[PDB]
RNA sequence: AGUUCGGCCAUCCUACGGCGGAAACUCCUUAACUCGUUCCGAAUUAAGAAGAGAAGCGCCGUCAGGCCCCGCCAGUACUGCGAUCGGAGACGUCGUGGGAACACGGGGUGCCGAACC
RNA sequence: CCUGCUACACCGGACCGCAGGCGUCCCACGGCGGGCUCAGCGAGGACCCUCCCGCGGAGCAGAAGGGCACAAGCCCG
RNA sequence: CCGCCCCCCAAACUCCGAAGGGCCGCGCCGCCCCGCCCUGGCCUGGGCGGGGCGGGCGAAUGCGGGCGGCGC
């Protein structure tokens, strides 16, 4: 969340010194461990078309038996 | 290798194709074969009698004998500096009629046909390996303008 | 809760059987051993005697397998037998014998249209006055024109002793076709001699006429239920051998087929 | 309403599972149906159960006809025309079983007492399409017997009252 | 439109709802004879015509599962030939040829041949 | 001597390379014909029996790989 | 127990599948007849030959080819 955003790159720095070779620390455009970008994810939630699992988010079904 | 039995190294080539198990269809026995014909050898792994060795899978030969149940096929085989003419006896499930001369019979029929028609001058009937293109005009009224793009990472 | 057997993985790997095996209309093991032929006989036709029964009708056909279909050379259906004088009882033992006789005579007359010398209907004219004895046309052994040869394809029927499939084969032999067979699976055989009188009884429909005779004796109320169509054509149970004997003679004379022009509806 | 839709009694199977009692048991089924009964052999060995393998364990006979219906109105008369509501399978069949076999009729017990399963199968006209050798196909889903259809039929034919 | 015999063996299969039958196929009725069931006419063998469109079968349907075609994925992954290109290496680059798959989105859902009604 | 892999999609290809097997067993556990369908899930039934669906998830002497459903498996003559 | 998502894998896993390799073909054909003898119901086929006819040289590039004996 936002309350930890400051200190994650400090902990990733710690881990880098335990691993052989050269490593790179980066910040992603995705929303969490999901597959949409923040702007993409925001809008999909904005209109409704996005599914929810437990901690992962999917799209509208649009396939198979209509309801029953 | 260290072990070299008759069907060694056959785990994939003698296996059946996906959703193509079971008995062969009956065209395997209603085809007519003749002396001098060209055939392909393809081993069907469900028929174990008269089944040729793995070396002969995917070769093309010529019929020399027509027997009651099996055909005799001649295969040219390279051995260490010379070619050998080998003769084998193979049952019908492992032979298919070959089209290696199909293209040549179509052309021989087409040249005598186009000669009969004469177009009063006889056309050129030699095959032609693709030539360089001739001169022509093309419009550039609507032309698109592209350029390299910037790196995105 | 309960595992599901037909997942989408089950369908992906499923191989269907040949269409005529799914419909339960062909056995391909037996069909391979009928049409097979030595390869130094390159394209010579080979024939099958096909006998199929339904409810209400018995079919015979002569057929040759080709690459992409098979040709029917001749066929006779037992619903034609009303024209030769057999009104009721089609699909019984006698009606199967007569239909095979019709198909055999019709084929030989078809292959001897125009031929003057030693035509296939004069040579091998078959038999007369059915006896129910063993007979083999390929014993005559004309040196120069052999008998027509065919094989009995019975399909999915059981090959029991006294089935109607074998009766239809027997009438094809008695009209001059070389069909290889033994007398086993006929009525009147005991592994120590084959007695032909018992075979003439089914051929002449004698078991049918004795059933009506007794059935009328005790339960005449059922005799109306059991045999209503027999009693409306006014054929009484004592004249079947009268009625079958005339029918055979009227078959050999005119085997030729008269096409019933027909009109359909969707 | 439709004929060719009526339910009938397809068959009734009497099964006796337990040295020469099976011989005594077979005679009992023999003198209750007028049919030679059969004998089953043992699939495994269970030293806990006391049966070796490949050995005469049970006996049973199948009954088909108006005979089957009569024996299945004396078996219920034992149970006082009472049947569990949950005794009807997902496929239109119901069963039950007695403990003393002389409760259909008094017989000099010589041959000893036994206890049987009465398992009944029903069907409609048409079920032949799934048993014949040639052109064999599954019966349609609507033409099959739901368990609610099976209860309404036996209570009409018999007088069972379904203790719940 | 239908039945018997076939070719290729799912665009033809599986599941669930429907709609049809003049003819045809089917279900169906029977245990004298034929032959048959580790027991059972269930099957099968024989003999039949009172009843049926309830099934099978033919047809129609379903943001149906499968199967089949096309586009995208993507000149990306990988790779043949050539390099006194870079790098400690692991690996990558350039020149000249060849070129996927998964996923994703749209479409489709047996035809051909002999004989008979 | 044999199977799979090493082995780089024709064939061929090394090691005291990797995981293993063979010197037997069967007059039926063999030949042929006919019939039949297996493993099992689900749901029933006195203290094995029945139906339904079932691409083989069983079996086929013993290694491993391949093959097979009106059969190459099981039962009978 | 069951259903939907999901991180990460295989020299002795593969429903898909390259680059790359491998084997065969690229000149004599048509059309009618006639002769000889295992195969077919036949007036069927199949094989080996003869005649009469119409034709005709049907990718590129380079270039003469094949067989044996004796021996290190
Ligand atoms: K580090
Ligand atoms: K070699
Ligand atoms: K129907
Ligand atoms: Mg057979």
PDB file of N, CA, C and O (backbone and C1' of nucleotides) in Angstrom, chain F residues 4-5 7 11-12 21 24 31 38 42 45 52-53 64 70:
ATOM      1  P     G F   4      13.906 -48.421 -27.500  1.00  0.00           P
ATOM      2  O5'   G F   4      14.017 -47.303 -26.375  1.00  0.00           O
ATOM      3  C5'   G F   4      12.875 -46.865 -25.660  1.00  0.00           C
ATOM      4  C4'   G F   4      13.220 -46.040 -24.445  1.00  0.00           C
ATOM      5  C3'   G F   4      14.155 -44.863 -24.635  1.00  0.00           C
ATOM      6  O3'   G F   4      13.555 -43.742 -25.239  1.00  0.00           O
ATOM      7  C1'   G F   4      14.744 -46.008 -22.678  1.00  0.00           C
ATOM      8  P     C F   5      14.402 -42.854 -26.262  1.00  0.00           P
ATOM      9  O5'   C F   5      15.500 -42.104 -25.383  1.00  0.00           O
ATOM     10  C5'   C F   5      15.135 -41.128 -24.423  1.00  0.00           C
ATOM     11  C4'   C F   5      16.257 -40.788 -23.471  1.00  0.00           C
ATOM     12  C3'   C F   5      17.511 -40.148 -24.036  1.00  0.00           C
ATOM     13  O3'   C F   5      17.346 -38.789 -24.405  1.00  0.00           O
ATOM     14  C1'   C F   5      18.102 -41.740 -22.399  1.00  0.00           C
ATOM     15  P     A F   7      23.556 -35.349 -25.929  1.00  0.00           P
ATOM     16  O5'   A F   7      22.345 -35.448 -26.952  1.00  0.00           O
ATOM     17  C5'   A F   7      22.457 -34.951 -28.281  1.00  0.00           C
ATOM     18  C4'   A F   7      21.934 -35.918 -29.314  1.00  0.00           C
ATOM     19  C3'   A F   7      20.717 -36.747 -28.915  1.00  0.00           C
ATOM     20  O3'   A F   7      19.938 -36.994 -30.084  1.00  0.00           O
ATOM     21  C1'   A F   7      22.470 -38.183 -29.509  1.00  0.00           C
ATOM     22  P     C F  11      17.002 -41.731 -38.208  1.00  0.00           P
ATOM     23  O5'   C F  11      18.203 -42.592 -38.808  1.00  0.00           O
ATOM     24  C5'   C F  11      18.004 -43.835 -39.476  1.00  0.00           C
ATOM     25  C4'   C F  11      19.263 -44.318 -40.165  1.00  0.00           C
ATOM     26  C3'   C F  11      20.474 -44.579 -39.283  1.00  0.00           C
ATOM     27  O3'   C F  11      20.434 -45.838 -38.629  1.00  0.00           O
ATOM     28  C1'   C F  11      21.136 -43.354 -41.195  1.00  0.00           C
ATOM     29  P     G F  12      20.846 -46.010 -37.084  1.00  0.00           P
ATOM     30  O5'   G F  12      22.399 -45.704 -37.029  1.00  0.00           O
ATOM     31  C5'   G F  12      23.359 -46.492 -37.709  1.00  0.00           C
ATOM     32  C4'   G F  12      24.674 -45.774 -37.794  1.00  0.00           C
ATOM     33  C3'   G F  12      25.290 -45.315 -36.487  1.00  0.00           C
ATOM     34  O3'   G F  12      25.936 -46.353 -35.767  1.00  0.00           O
ATOM     35  C1'   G F  12      25.465 -43.592 -38.094  1.00  0.00           C
ATOM     36  P     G F  21      17.752 -54.883 -12.828  1.00  0.00           P
ATOM     37  O5'   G F  21      17.392 -55.665 -14.164  1.00  0.00           O
ATOM     38  C5'   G F  21      16.052 -55.997 -14.480  1.00  0.00           C
ATOM     39  C4'   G F  21      15.898 -56.439 -15.912  1.00  0.00           C
ATOM     40  C3'   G F  21      16.454 -57.798 -16.275  1.00  0.00           C
ATOM     41  O3'   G F  21      15.641 -58.865 -15.835  1.00  0.00           O
ATOM     42  C1'   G F  21      17.013 -56.253 -17.960  1.00  0.00           C
ATOM     43  P     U F  24      18.472 -71.309 -19.693  1.00  0.00           P
ATOM     44  O5'   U F  24      17.648 -71.438 -18.343  1.00  0.00           O
ATOM     45  C5'   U F  24      16.262 -71.729 -18.364  1.00  0.00           C
ATOM     46  C4'   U F  24      15.490 -70.761 -17.508  1.00  0.00           C
ATOM     47  C3'   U F  24      14.021 -71.072 -17.284  1.00  0.00           C
ATOM     48  O3'   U F  24      13.835 -71.999 -16.230  1.00  0.00           O
ATOM     49  C1'   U F  24      14.299 -68.777 -17.822  1.00  0.00           C
ATOM     50  P     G F  31      -1.893 -68.674 -30.446  1.00  0.00           P
ATOM     51  O5'   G F  31      -2.302 -69.908 -31.364  1.00  0.00           O
ATOM     52  C5'   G F  31      -1.622 -70.199 -32.572  1.00  0.00           C
ATOM     53  C4'   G F  31      -2.473 -71.035 -33.493  1.00  0.00           C
ATOM     54  C3'   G F  31      -3.833 -70.454 -33.820  1.00  0.00           C
ATOM     55  O3'   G F  31      -3.780 -69.481 -34.848  1.00  0.00           O
ATOM     56  C1'   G F  31      -4.081 -72.719 -33.207  1.00  0.00           C
ATOM     57  P     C F  38     -17.366 -54.835 -18.260  1.00  0.00           P
ATOM     58  O5'   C F  38     -16.040 -55.181 -17.455  1.00  0.00           O
ATOM     59  C5'   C F  38     -15.269 -56.335 -17.757  1.00  0.00           C
ATOM     60  C4'   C F  38     -13.801 -56.007 -17.866  1.00  0.00           C
ATOM     61  C3'   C F  38     -13.245 -55.123 -16.766  1.00  0.00           C
ATOM     62  O3'   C F  38     -12.907 -55.855 -15.601  1.00  0.00           O
ATOM     63  C1'   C F  38     -12.508 -54.340 -18.880  1.00  0.00           C
ATOM     64  P     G F  42     -17.780 -42.680  -5.559  1.00  0.00           P
ATOM     65  O5'   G F  42     -19.187 -42.376  -6.224  1.00  0.00           O
ATOM     66  C5'   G F  42     -19.506 -41.055  -6.621  1.00  0.00           C
ATOM     67  C4'   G F  42     -20.808 -40.990  -7.365  1.00  0.00           C
ATOM     68  C3'   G F  42     -22.014 -41.551  -6.648  1.00  0.00           C
ATOM     69  O3'   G F  42     -22.521 -40.674  -5.659  1.00  0.00           O
ATOM     70  C1'   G F  42     -22.013 -42.309  -8.879  1.00  0.00           C
ATOM     71  P     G F  45     -30.923 -48.532  -0.043  1.00  0.00           P
ATOM     72  O5'   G F  45     -31.151 -50.090   0.192  1.00  0.00           O
ATOM     73  C5'   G F  45     -32.210 -50.778  -0.447  1.00  0.00           C
ATOM     74  C4'   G F  45     -31.857 -52.213  -0.766  1.00  0.00           C
ATOM     75  C3'   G F  45     -31.228 -53.042   0.340  1.00  0.00           C
ATOM     76  O3'   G F  45     -32.172 -53.506   1.293  1.00  0.00           O
ATOM     77  C1'   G F  45     -30.099 -53.444  -1.696  1.00  0.00           C
ATOM     78  P     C F  52     -28.817 -50.092 -17.767  1.00  0.00           P
ATOM     79  O5'   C F  52     -28.174 -48.643 -17.793  1.00  0.00           O
ATOM     80  C5'   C F  52     -28.957 -47.496 -17.522  1.00  0.00           C
ATOM     81  C4'   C F  52     -28.143 -46.412 -16.866  1.00  0.00           C
ATOM     82  C3'   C F  52     -26.870 -45.989 -17.577  1.00  0.00           C
ATOM     83  O3'   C F  52     -27.102 -45.132 -18.679  1.00  0.00           O
ATOM     84  C1'   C F  52     -26.450 -46.228 -15.266  1.00  0.00           C
ATOM     85  P     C F  53     -26.430 -45.442 -20.102  1.00  0.00           P
ATOM     86  O5'   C F  53     -24.999 -44.752 -20.037  1.00  0.00           O
ATOM     87  C5'   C F  53     -24.845 -43.345 -20.064  1.00  0.00           C
ATOM     88  C4'   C F  53     -23.601 -42.914 -19.324  1.00  0.00           C
ATOM     89  C3'   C F  53     -22.262 -43.299 -19.934  1.00  0.00           C
ATOM     90  O3'   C F  53     -21.861 -42.483 -21.019  1.00  0.00           O
ATOM     91  C1'   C F  53     -22.223 -43.770 -17.635  1.00  0.00           C
ATOM     92  P     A F  64       9.862 -51.762 -16.082  1.00  0.00           P
ATOM     93  O5'   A F  64      10.133 -50.866 -17.365  1.00  0.00           O
ATOM     94  C5'   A F  64      11.041 -49.774 -17.354  1.00  0.00           C
ATOM     95  C4'   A F  64      11.522 -49.468 -18.747  1.00  0.00           C
ATOM     96  C3'   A F  64      10.458 -49.019 -19.738  1.00  0.00           C
ATOM     97  O3'   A F  64      10.171 -47.634 -19.669  1.00  0.00           O
ATOM     98  C1'   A F  64      11.719 -50.762 -20.690  1.00  0.00           C
ATOM     99  P     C F  70     -14.790 -53.059 -31.438  1.00  0.00           P
ATOM    100  O5'   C F  70     -14.843 -54.636 -31.630  1.00  0.00           O
ATOM    101  C5'   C F  70     -14.967 -55.520 -30.527  1.00  0.00           C
ATOM    102  C4'   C F  70     -16.153 -56.446 -30.658  1.00  0.00           C
ATOM    103  C3'   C F  70     -16.164 -57.414 -31.827  1.00  0.00           C
ATOM    104  O3'   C F  70     -15.362 -58.557 -31.602  1.00  0.00           O
ATOM    105  C1'   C F  70     -18.326 -56.469 -31.502  1.00  0.00           C
TER     106        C F  70
END
